[PDB]
Amino acid sequence: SLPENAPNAVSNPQQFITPATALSAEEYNVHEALGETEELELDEFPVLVFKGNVPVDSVTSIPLDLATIYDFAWDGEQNAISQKFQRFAHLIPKSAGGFGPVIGNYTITANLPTGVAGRILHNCLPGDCVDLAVSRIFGLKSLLGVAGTAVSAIGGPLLNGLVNTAAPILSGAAHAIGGNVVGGLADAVIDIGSNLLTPKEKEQPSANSSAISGDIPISRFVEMLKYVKENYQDNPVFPTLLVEPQNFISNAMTALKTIPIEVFANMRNVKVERNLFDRTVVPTVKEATLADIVIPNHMYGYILRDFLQNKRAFQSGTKQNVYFQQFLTVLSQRNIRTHITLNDITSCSIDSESIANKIERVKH
Amino acid sequence: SLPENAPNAVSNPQQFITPATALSAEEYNVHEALGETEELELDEFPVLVFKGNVPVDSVTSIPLDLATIYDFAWDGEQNAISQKFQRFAHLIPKSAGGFGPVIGNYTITANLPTGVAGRILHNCLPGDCVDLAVSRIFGLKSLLGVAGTAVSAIGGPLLNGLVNTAAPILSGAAHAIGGNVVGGLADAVIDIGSNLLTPKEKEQPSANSSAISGDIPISRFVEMLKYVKENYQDNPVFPTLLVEPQNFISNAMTALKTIPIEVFANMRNVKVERNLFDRTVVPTVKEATLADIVIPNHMYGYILRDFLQNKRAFQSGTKQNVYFQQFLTVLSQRNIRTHITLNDITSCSIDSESIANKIERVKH
Amino acid sequence: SLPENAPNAVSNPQQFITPATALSAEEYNVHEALGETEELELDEFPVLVFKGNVPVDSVTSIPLDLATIYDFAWDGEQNAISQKFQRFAHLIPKSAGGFGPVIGNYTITANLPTGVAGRILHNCLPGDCVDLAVSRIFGLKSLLGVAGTAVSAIGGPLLNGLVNTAAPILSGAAHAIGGNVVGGLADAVIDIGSNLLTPKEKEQPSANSSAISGDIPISRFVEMLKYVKENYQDNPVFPTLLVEPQNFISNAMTALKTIPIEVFANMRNVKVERNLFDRTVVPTVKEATLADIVIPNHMYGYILRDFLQNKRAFQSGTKQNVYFQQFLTVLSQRNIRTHITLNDITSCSIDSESIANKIERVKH
Amino acid sequence: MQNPTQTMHIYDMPLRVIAGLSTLAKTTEEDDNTSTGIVVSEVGEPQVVNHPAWIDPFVAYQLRAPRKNITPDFIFGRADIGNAFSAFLPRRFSAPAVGTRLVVDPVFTYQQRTVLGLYNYFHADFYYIVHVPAPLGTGIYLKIYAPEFDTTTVTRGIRFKPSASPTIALSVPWSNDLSTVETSVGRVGQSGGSIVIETIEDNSNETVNTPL
């Protein structure tokens, strides 16, 4: 499933704000003829990966590490995506895209009243290139400058980021008082491969809800998706979702901050192999929060270069100069391991000021 | 009526947020070739089952006990659904769904101005599995984790939870000043079995109103629906509607609480048998409020287990720890009967604190 | 004109909230082959019958007595409907509906900003059954319990109760700056009998405006509509419009009260006979307000019974107990006439309290 | 492959009535009591019943509508007893007063209680033959129906005059919201196989020994 549509040579500006990621998928190195498709009903539950408030005019990272992921719409220990990583050793992507092999989609949704109005920039970078993720988080670069970025305007008078399910019962709710159940069942049984409207979500459009969604790529060198958690700190595989709310004014023409959103995810694009029994080392889902980000050893000079080619990171009192003094301090620390964390570049101490942080770093 | 549409194998994500409840109906044990269809005009009045305010970010139970139900849109003693239980002994469901045999639909509606915006999660569990109902009420589990849950976004700029009737007169209101009566009559006489738009509710859509609706299942072991009120406290049959309003912010970006909704219901999917005269023991519709919930004797360890596999129910000061100390106290009481009520786990006293409530319970 | 469409046996719940009023029209006793159709251009002016504020969660009576009716959109003595009753003795309805012969339609309209949102219940009972009118006015019964009630949600993001005319000039306004005149002329000359959209009100829908309308029935025993004003106080013929605004919250989630609406009416479904000259007794249109309601002598025990089967009318401090003590006082008065007025059951004095009002009434 | 079903045979039917009653009609064409006035039936005209424990066929009034009776077979153990060791067993009752009510509870033979005692759950259908011998000055008018929930509830049944049709016969199928009740317990509120006899009038002589 989850096809590979061929675009045109030139992208039409009325649909896309960036060029296309590629004109063909990138299915080398992935061993697609290897597993066995395993469609159980547990795969059809989505996962509430992120829920909460998100600051306006700042890129927010959502580390989308599906092996150790937590579900905020469920109180249990495992969920629909992480139990798939408990049961099997090998997960094999079905198809691919312009970034890498792709294993799922995400969905951003936000129920807003009509008195606020803004827009959302979103992109999901594979994690083979985490520099482009981290440079966007630190305010050094914007999301509009990398291919694959979409813009969706949640306001509104606008029916964009919204979820409408219409329950999967065999009755279809044919005796409903004062209105029609739109797109539920006993309208159309639209296939997962096809992409159509039912017939009733063509004149409704409150229940049609043009979604804010992308895909979940992994990385373009692995053959399958065997998770070890020591190897993926050295060569990361799982992607990172980048979200940026831009304008968001109120009816008093006052710029808002910290809007509420929530992100759903599913992984319905994989094949399985090597079913495992009574194992000891498990992928250890962290309770109640998240994963963080891993910056490996060979990514340091790429993060270092992007601060240096930024005129705003040198002047004091700005947000980029805070991260850059926190970045130079962590490089002068003592690391027994071969990677640092984004949280280490947020909860660190401070010195004075920029140049002496670099002279002490070329000696260490 | 009220058909049984066959879905696809994999549910399309643009319509459904959960997997399908089943791929076929579950019409074993129900004796469909037994009654006689009885279509009187009183069946075409819906019943306002619930009306009032409902708290945000908390699952609200609506016990949908149709034998003893009250109508808030009518002041009389009986109504359209409960008089059907007065007149006959046996009610026979026509068709079935993924949960059980199904006897009707509900409809949630809410007239909101454009300055507030949220979403609604709703599901209607059969009552053969009341543990999944009660675990969701107590905040132990969410509605997104069980099959059949729909999500509808009432805001809004959105035309979702709304009722438009357009009166059933034979004139059709053909002399109306300044506008067309949409979908009333002298447009189309759309059948109850078919699911179409008239021709005038295709370009109107203010009067089309994509509904928030599900179905009313009963239970998968009974042969018909003979109501005794002593047997249904031991093996419950009637379902429970679970409603959860999620976000609901205002134009000041302030989270609301306690939104107003109201719920309609109908039972137009049954056959009748065994017409009864001058009876003494009647199903006793309770005036002006509701039914409550019955938790039978064989459901205690299922409620007990779900508190134990919840990390939030053990820490003090939270909402789940209040219910769990109220649950352990009621099990240490004296019950002459073989069931407890959800109201007994709300209006109970308190002790100190968790562990000593369980040591005194293993002795009783 | 104004046809008689045949509905299905079972009403579809996505369009209707009540059962159908009848499956056939009720054209006995009306002498349709009697008059002569008289289409003058004065008939194509609607009448603003009601204008003003209307309280929320209370049924508001609009006595729709077309012989003596006042127009609030015109300052003159007569209007489009009442001059028809000046000129002729006999008015003959063309066609009929489930209630009675029908002579016109009404239209409720309300221009609301997007920051408030509610719903409207409306029904127009013939006046052969004024008990069902008066029981709804006094809060004893709701509009959802009688056949023919429609529900329309004015909010909004919703384009429901709105009037768009697009002036009847022969030019069609073909030179209009920056937009198209929708449905005026030089689009389509849609017939009064047909029910179509032009072609331009199919993609506009701001100018399509799904209307809030019903019909104006009279009564099922008269042969024609000879108005005497003494006979219609004993056996009333003209209908009564019942309007109920339900929820109506603001952006501060605060329940409103007293919304503004206005009601249009027309009578374009009649035939005339017996043209009258230099008459003395005229139907006397009352200046600047309205008619009231007439409750005849044989309707007393029907109003009396509905208070008695209401548990809320006996407890003190409620609105229904105020009317019931005012109803029992008027029955103990001295009536030289054979009917009472609804205004007599509003502007009356008070006693103490309920039971002694009834013991003094069984003696008078 | 299913474990095989085994059959046992019973041979010649203990307590079989081999000389029946002459007042009970064998075919529907020889029965017109509904037509003139003798039987006032609200459940239809009587249909022909063939049963092995009674020698000749007889017409019976269907007090409940005939059905198929789903038998769930998922647990271990199943048996079709099926008219084996089956008999029409008689009992005498006095006719009640005009206000009161008589409930006849069903009975069954010793050999049916033994074989059905090897199992836990059952269902069955029932038949009744009511005979009121009416000597001379009999003006009784009776009423028979099936009880439903409690003591006062009345359903559709038959009314008849025993002076002109002394024997009446009935057919009571299994109607319950649970198939296969427990044998010794039953469901609360069930009908079972009970019938209800009620006296409407007593227009008899002074010489007739009443409570007949």
PDB file of N, CA, C and O in Angstrom, chain B residues 91-139:
ATOM      1  N   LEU B  91     -39.316  -7.541  22.240  1.00  0.00           N
ATOM      2  CA  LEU B  91     -38.864  -6.664  21.179  1.00  0.00           C
ATOM      3  C   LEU B  91     -37.727  -7.378  20.472  1.00  0.00           C
ATOM      4  O   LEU B  91     -36.866  -7.964  21.123  1.00  0.00           O
ATOM      5  N   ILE B  92     -37.758  -7.396  19.151  1.00  0.00           N
ATOM      6  CA  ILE B  92     -36.830  -8.210  18.380  1.00  0.00           C
ATOM      7  C   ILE B  92     -36.054  -7.284  17.455  1.00  0.00           C
ATOM      8  O   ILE B  92     -36.661  -6.601  16.632  1.00  0.00           O
ATOM      9  N   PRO B  93     -34.728  -7.225  17.548  1.00  0.00           N
ATOM     10  CA  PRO B  93     -33.957  -6.381  16.628  1.00  0.00           C
ATOM     11  C   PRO B  93     -34.008  -6.888  15.196  1.00  0.00           C
ATOM     12  O   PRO B  93     -34.011  -8.094  14.949  1.00  0.00           O
ATOM     13  N   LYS B  94     -34.073  -5.955  14.247  1.00  0.00           N
ATOM     14  CA  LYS B  94     -34.137  -6.333  12.840  1.00  0.00           C
ATOM     15  C   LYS B  94     -32.798  -6.843  12.344  1.00  0.00           C
ATOM     16  O   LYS B  94     -32.714  -7.901  11.717  1.00  0.00           O
ATOM     17  N   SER B  95     -31.744  -6.071  12.573  1.00  0.00           N
ATOM     18  CA  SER B  95     -30.430  -6.346  12.031  1.00  0.00           C
ATOM     19  C   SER B  95     -29.389  -6.107  13.112  1.00  0.00           C
ATOM     20  O   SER B  95     -29.714  -5.758  14.248  1.00  0.00           O
ATOM     21  N   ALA B  96     -28.123  -6.280  12.751  1.00  0.00           N
ATOM     22  CA  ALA B  96     -27.044  -6.293  13.718  1.00  0.00           C
ATOM     23  C   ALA B  96     -25.846  -5.540  13.174  1.00  0.00           C
ATOM     24  O   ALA B  96     -25.823  -5.108  12.021  1.00  0.00           O
ATOM     25  N   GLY B  97     -24.843  -5.398  14.026  1.00  0.00           N
ATOM     26  CA  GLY B  97     -23.599  -4.756  13.670  1.00  0.00           C
ATOM     27  C   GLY B  97     -22.411  -5.473  14.270  1.00  0.00           C
ATOM     28  O   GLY B  97     -22.505  -6.643  14.634  1.00  0.00           O
ATOM     29  N   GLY B  98     -21.287  -4.773  14.388  1.00  0.00           N
ATOM     30  CA  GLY B  98     -20.082  -5.405  14.893  1.00  0.00           C
ATOM     31  C   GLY B  98     -20.109  -5.648  16.383  1.00  0.00           C
ATOM     32  O   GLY B  98     -19.412  -6.533  16.882  1.00  0.00           O
ATOM     33  N   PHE B  99     -20.898  -4.874  17.118  1.00  0.00           N
ATOM     34  CA  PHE B  99     -21.016  -5.086  18.553  1.00  0.00           C
ATOM     35  C   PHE B  99     -22.051  -6.151  18.872  1.00  0.00           C
ATOM     36  O   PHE B  99     -21.761  -7.129  19.565  1.00  0.00           O
ATOM     37  N   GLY B 100     -23.265  -5.958  18.393  1.00  0.00           N
ATOM     38  CA  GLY B 100     -24.392  -6.761  18.780  1.00  0.00           C
ATOM     39  C   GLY B 100     -25.539  -6.475  17.846  1.00  0.00           C
ATOM     40  O   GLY B 100     -25.370  -5.775  16.847  1.00  0.00           O
ATOM     41  N   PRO B 101     -26.700  -7.071  18.100  1.00  0.00           N
ATOM     42  CA  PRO B 101     -27.923  -6.607  17.439  1.00  0.00           C
ATOM     43  C   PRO B 101     -28.179  -5.152  17.784  1.00  0.00           C
ATOM     44  O   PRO B 101     -27.911  -4.707  18.894  1.00  0.00           O
ATOM     45  N   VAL B 102     -28.675  -4.400  16.815  1.00  0.00           N
ATOM     46  CA  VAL B 102     -28.808  -2.957  16.947  1.00  0.00           C
ATOM     47  C   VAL B 102     -30.275  -2.567  16.809  1.00  0.00           C
ATOM     48  O   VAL B 102     -30.998  -3.104  15.965  1.00  0.00           O
ATOM     49  N   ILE B 103     -30.728  -1.668  17.679  1.00  0.00           N
ATOM     50  CA  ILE B 103     -32.138  -1.308  17.765  1.00  0.00           C
ATOM     51  C   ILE B 103     -32.417   0.157  17.466  1.00  0.00           C
ATOM     52  O   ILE B 103     -33.591   0.527  17.365  1.00  0.00           O
ATOM     53  N   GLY B 104     -31.412   1.009  17.327  1.00  0.00           N
ATOM     54  CA  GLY B 104     -31.697   2.406  17.055  1.00  0.00           C
ATOM     55  C   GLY B 104     -30.420   3.186  16.865  1.00  0.00           C
ATOM     56  O   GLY B 104     -29.319   2.638  16.917  1.00  0.00           O
ATOM     57  N   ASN B 105     -30.582   4.483  16.633  1.00  0.00           N
ATOM     58  CA  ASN B 105     -29.472   5.413  16.517  1.00  0.00           C
ATOM     59  C   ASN B 105     -29.637   6.517  17.549  1.00  0.00           C
ATOM     60  O   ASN B 105     -30.741   6.787  18.019  1.00  0.00           O
ATOM     61  N   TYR B 106     -28.529   7.155  17.906  1.00  0.00           N
ATOM     62  CA  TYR B 106     -28.548   8.392  18.669  1.00  0.00           C
ATOM     63  C   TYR B 106     -28.022   9.527  17.804  1.00  0.00           C
ATOM     64  O   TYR B 106     -27.426   9.309  16.754  1.00  0.00           O
ATOM     65  N   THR B 107     -28.234  10.752  18.271  1.00  0.00           N
ATOM     66  CA  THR B 107     -27.734  11.933  17.582  1.00  0.00           C
ATOM     67  C   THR B 107     -27.354  12.966  18.624  1.00  0.00           C
ATOM     68  O   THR B 107     -28.186  13.354  19.443  1.00  0.00           O
ATOM     69  N   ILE B 108     -26.107  13.405  18.587  1.00  0.00           N
ATOM     70  CA  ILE B 108     -25.610  14.477  19.435  1.00  0.00           C
ATOM     71  C   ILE B 108     -25.686  15.765  18.637  1.00  0.00           C
ATOM     72  O   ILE B 108     -25.219  15.818  17.494  1.00  0.00           O
ATOM     73  N   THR B 109     -26.273  16.803  19.221  1.00  0.00           N
ATOM     74  CA  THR B 109     -26.338  18.094  18.559  1.00  0.00           C
ATOM     75  C   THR B 109     -26.016  19.202  19.548  1.00  0.00           C
ATOM     76  O   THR B 109     -26.221  19.062  20.754  1.00  0.00           O
ATOM     77  N   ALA B 110     -25.477  20.299  19.018  1.00  0.00           N
ATOM     78  CA  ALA B 110     -25.011  21.416  19.836  1.00  0.00           C
ATOM     79  C   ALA B 110     -24.954  22.668  18.979  1.00  0.00           C
ATOM     80  O   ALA B 110     -24.203  22.711  18.004  1.00  0.00           O
ATOM     81  N   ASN B 111     -25.722  23.684  19.346  1.00  0.00           N
ATOM     82  CA  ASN B 111     -25.744  24.954  18.624  1.00  0.00           C
ATOM     83  C   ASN B 111     -24.722  25.873  19.271  1.00  0.00           C
ATOM     84  O   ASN B 111     -24.940  26.387  20.365  1.00  0.00           O
ATOM     85  N   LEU B 112     -23.599  26.080  18.593  1.00  0.00           N
ATOM     86  CA  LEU B 112     -22.511  26.881  19.116  1.00  0.00           C
ATOM     87  C   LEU B 112     -22.257  28.103  18.250  1.00  0.00           C
ATOM     88  O   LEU B 112     -22.362  28.023  17.024  1.00  0.00           O
ATOM     89  N   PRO B 113     -21.919  29.240  18.848  1.00  0.00           N
ATOM     90  CA  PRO B 113     -21.472  30.384  18.056  1.00  0.00           C
ATOM     91  C   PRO B 113     -20.058  30.160  17.557  1.00  0.00           C
ATOM     92  O   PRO B 113     -19.368  29.224  17.954  1.00  0.00           O
ATOM     93  N   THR B 114     -19.616  31.048  16.677  1.00  0.00           N
ATOM     94  CA  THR B 114     -18.354  30.830  15.989  1.00  0.00           C
ATOM     95  C   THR B 114     -17.137  31.110  16.856  1.00  0.00           C
ATOM     96  O   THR B 114     -16.023  30.786  16.445  1.00  0.00           O
ATOM     97  N   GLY B 115     -17.311  31.688  18.032  1.00  0.00           N
ATOM     98  CA  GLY B 115     -16.200  32.070  18.871  1.00  0.00           C
ATOM     99  C   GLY B 115     -15.652  31.020  19.800  1.00  0.00           C
ATOM    100  O   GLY B 115     -14.755  31.329  20.584  1.00  0.00           O
ATOM    101  N   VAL B 116     -16.188  29.804  19.790  1.00  0.00           N
ATOM    102  CA  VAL B 116     -15.619  28.678  20.519  1.00  0.00           C
ATOM    103  C   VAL B 116     -15.398  27.567  19.506  1.00  0.00           C
ATOM    104  O   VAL B 116     -15.995  27.568  18.434  1.00  0.00           O
ATOM    105  N   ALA B 117     -14.512  26.627  19.835  1.00  0.00           N
ATOM    106  CA  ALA B 117     -14.147  25.575  18.884  1.00  0.00           C
ATOM    107  C   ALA B 117     -13.524  24.407  19.620  1.00  0.00           C
ATOM    108  O   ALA B 117     -12.527  24.587  20.316  1.00  0.00           O
ATOM    109  N   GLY B 118     -14.080  23.213  19.432  1.00  0.00           N
ATOM    110  CA  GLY B 118     -13.535  22.003  20.011  1.00  0.00           C
ATOM    111  C   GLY B 118     -13.804  20.756  19.198  1.00  0.00           C
ATOM    112  O   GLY B 118     -14.020  20.844  17.992  1.00  0.00           O
ATOM    113  N   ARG B 119     -13.772  19.587  19.825  1.00  0.00           N
ATOM    114  CA  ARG B 119     -14.101  18.354  19.128  1.00  0.00           C
ATOM    115  C   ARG B 119     -14.790  17.417  20.104  1.00  0.00           C
ATOM    116  O   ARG B 119     -14.692  17.577  21.318  1.00  0.00           O
ATOM    117  N   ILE B 120     -15.497  16.435  19.554  1.00  0.00           N
ATOM    118  CA  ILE B 120     -16.300  15.495  20.326  1.00  0.00           C
ATOM    119  C   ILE B 120     -15.861  14.081  19.983  1.00  0.00           C
ATOM    120  O   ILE B 120     -15.809  13.715  18.807  1.00  0.00           O
ATOM    121  N   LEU B 121     -15.546  13.295  21.003  1.00  0.00           N
ATOM    122  CA  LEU B 121     -15.368  11.858  20.860  1.00  0.00           C
ATOM    123  C   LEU B 121     -16.603  11.160  21.395  1.00  0.00           C
ATOM    124  O   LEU B 121     -17.054  11.464  22.499  1.00  0.00           O
ATOM    125  N   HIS B 122     -17.146  10.224  20.624  1.00  0.00           N
ATOM    126  CA  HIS B 122     -18.324   9.503  21.070  1.00  0.00           C
ATOM    127  C   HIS B 122     -18.262   8.045  20.651  1.00  0.00           C
ATOM    128  O   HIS B 122     -17.712   7.699  19.607  1.00  0.00           O
ATOM    129  N   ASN B 123     -18.832   7.195  21.498  1.00  0.00           N
ATOM    130  CA  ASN B 123     -18.905   5.764  21.267  1.00  0.00           C
ATOM    131  C   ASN B 123     -20.029   5.230  22.135  1.00  0.00           C
ATOM    132  O   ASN B 123     -20.345   5.813  23.170  1.00  0.00           O
ATOM    133  N   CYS B 124     -20.631   4.123  21.717  1.00  0.00           N
ATOM    134  CA  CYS B 124     -21.758   3.538  22.441  1.00  0.00           C
ATOM    135  C   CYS B 124     -21.513   2.043  22.598  1.00  0.00           C
ATOM    136  O   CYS B 124     -21.753   1.270  21.670  1.00  0.00           O
ATOM    137  N   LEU B 125     -21.040   1.648  23.762  1.00  0.00           N
ATOM    138  CA  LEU B 125     -20.652   0.279  24.068  1.00  0.00           C
ATOM    139  C   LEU B 125     -21.858  -0.526  24.545  1.00  0.00           C
ATOM    140  O   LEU B 125     -22.715   0.019  25.235  1.00  0.00           O
ATOM    141  N   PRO B 126     -21.923  -1.828  24.229  1.00  0.00           N
ATOM    142  CA  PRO B 126     -23.184  -2.574  24.370  1.00  0.00           C
ATOM    143  C   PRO B 126     -23.662  -2.804  25.788  1.00  0.00           C
ATOM    144  O   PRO B 126     -24.861  -2.999  25.985  1.00  0.00           O
ATOM    145  N   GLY B 127     -22.798  -2.801  26.784  1.00  0.00           N
ATOM    146  CA  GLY B 127     -23.234  -3.136  28.115  1.00  0.00           C
ATOM    147  C   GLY B 127     -23.068  -4.592  28.466  1.00  0.00           C
ATOM    148  O   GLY B 127     -23.122  -4.947  29.643  1.00  0.00           O
ATOM    149  N   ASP B 128     -22.871  -5.446  27.469  1.00  0.00           N
ATOM    150  CA  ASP B 128     -22.270  -6.744  27.725  1.00  0.00           C
ATOM    151  C   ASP B 128     -20.837  -6.570  28.213  1.00  0.00           C
ATOM    152  O   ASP B 128     -20.340  -7.382  28.997  1.00  0.00           O
ATOM    153  N   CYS B 129     -20.171  -5.511  27.767  1.00  0.00           N
ATOM    154  CA  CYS B 129     -18.857  -5.099  28.246  1.00  0.00           C
ATOM    155  C   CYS B 129     -18.969  -3.714  28.893  1.00  0.00           C
ATOM    156  O   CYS B 129     -18.658  -2.692  28.280  1.00  0.00           O
ATOM    157  N   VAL B 130     -19.397  -3.686  30.161  1.00  0.00           N
ATOM    158  CA  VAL B 130     -19.479  -2.432  30.908  1.00  0.00           C
ATOM    159  C   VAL B 130     -18.160  -2.020  31.526  1.00  0.00           C
ATOM    160  O   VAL B 130     -18.054  -0.898  32.035  1.00  0.00           O
ATOM    161  N   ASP B 131     -17.167  -2.902  31.531  1.00  0.00           N
ATOM    162  CA  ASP B 131     -15.855  -2.557  32.061  1.00  0.00           C
ATOM    163  C   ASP B 131     -15.188  -1.516  31.198  1.00  0.00           C
ATOM    164  O   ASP B 131     -14.540  -0.597  31.705  1.00  0.00           O
ATOM    165  N   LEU B 132     -15.324  -1.666  29.887  1.00  0.00           N
ATOM    166  CA  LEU B 132     -14.786  -0.699  28.952  1.00  0.00           C
ATOM    167  C   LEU B 132     -15.546   0.613  29.039  1.00  0.00           C
ATOM    168  O   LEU B 132     -14.998   1.664  28.712  1.00  0.00           O
ATOM    169  N   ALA B 133     -16.798   0.577  29.485  1.00  0.00           N
ATOM    170  CA  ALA B 133     -17.509   1.818  29.752  1.00  0.00           C
ATOM    171  C   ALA B 133     -16.967   2.494  31.003  1.00  0.00           C
ATOM    172  O   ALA B 133     -16.606   3.674  30.976  1.00  0.00           O
ATOM    173  N   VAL B 134     -16.870   1.744  32.098  1.00  0.00           N
ATOM    174  CA  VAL B 134     -16.550   2.317  33.398  1.00  0.00           C
ATOM    175  C   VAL B 134     -15.087   2.733  33.486  1.00  0.00           C
ATOM    176  O   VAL B 134     -14.764   3.748  34.113  1.00  0.00           O
ATOM    177  N   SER B 135     -14.192   1.997  32.828  1.00  0.00           N
ATOM    178  CA  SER B 135     -12.788   2.391  32.764  1.00  0.00           C
ATOM    179  C   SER B 135     -12.590   3.701  32.020  1.00  0.00           C
ATOM    180  O   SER B 135     -11.663   4.454  32.332  1.00  0.00           O
ATOM    181  N   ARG B 136     -13.437   3.986  31.037  1.00  0.00           N
ATOM    182  CA  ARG B 136     -13.349   5.266  30.355  1.00  0.00           C
ATOM    183  C   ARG B 136     -13.935   6.398  31.184  1.00  0.00           C
ATOM    184  O   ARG B 136     -13.443   7.527  31.097  1.00  0.00           O
ATOM    185  N   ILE B 137     -14.961   6.119  31.993  1.00  0.00           N
ATOM    186  CA  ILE B 137     -15.576   7.145  32.834  1.00  0.00           C
ATOM    187  C   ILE B 137     -14.598   7.624  33.895  1.00  0.00           C
ATOM    188  O   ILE B 137     -14.459   8.827  34.139  1.00  0.00           O
ATOM    189  N   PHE B 138     -13.863   6.698  34.495  1.00  0.00           N
ATOM    190  CA  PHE B 138     -12.955   7.015  35.586  1.00  0.00           C
ATOM    191  C   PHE B 138     -11.635   7.619  35.129  1.00  0.00           C
ATOM    192  O   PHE B 138     -10.756   7.832  35.969  1.00  0.00           O
ATOM    193  N   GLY B 139     -11.459   7.897  33.844  1.00  0.00           N
ATOM    194  CA  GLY B 139     -10.215   8.464  33.374  1.00  0.00           C
ATOM    195  C   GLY B 139      -9.080   7.480  33.257  1.00  0.00           C
ATOM    196  O   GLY B 139      -7.943   7.894  33.013  1.00  0.00           O
TER     197      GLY B 139
END
